[PDB]
Amino acid sequence: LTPNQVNDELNKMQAFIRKEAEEKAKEIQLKADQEYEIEKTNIVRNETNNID
């Protein structure tokens, strides 16, 4: 259309897209770390139970 509006929007939509990608990133790290914690604390309890 006109250079200014395209210049703004072309980059801005993808800027929000990557903001959403950052939100996805934070979500994946958070959930994966929580799964890590719970699986560790669940396996260790049973290991020690059997050991003792």
Binding site: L1, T2, D8, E9, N11, K12, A15
Partner: protein, 112 residues
């Protein structure tokens, strides 16, 4: 009725004044939305306020508003402009929320 009036007056005026602030902050947020749409990447700019004696809009807006619209577009030029909505046809709605024909910038009715 005596107590009713004499207290409710102060209560209502107090609620009124405390509300005013958010009642206008919402439209401030609206124009911020309008901005982040119309020019995007830096979400804020000189979103300018005006303070001028009343009964003068006729010869206190046209030149500057038309010039800023001129800058805001480079493919269309006509004579009739506004915001109104009339259910006549696809034409004649004039907003970015409803249809529009020629409406570059954004302003609103602001008064206490």
């Amino acid at each position: 009725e005596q107590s009713l009036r004499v207290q409710l007056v102060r209560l209502a005026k107090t609620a009124y004044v405390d509300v005013f602030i958010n009642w206008f902050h919402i439209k401030a947020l609206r124009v911020y939305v309008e901005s982040v749409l119309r020019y995007g990447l830096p979400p804020h700019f000189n979103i300018k306020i005006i303070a001028v004696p009343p009964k003068n809009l006729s010869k206190c807006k046209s030149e500057l508003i038309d010039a800023f619209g001129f800058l805001g577009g480079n493919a269309f030029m006509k004579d009739k402009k506004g915001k109104i909505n009339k259910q006549d046809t696809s034409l004649h709605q004039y907003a970015s929320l409803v249809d529009t024909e020629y409406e570059p910038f954004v302003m609103y009715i602001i008064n206490l």
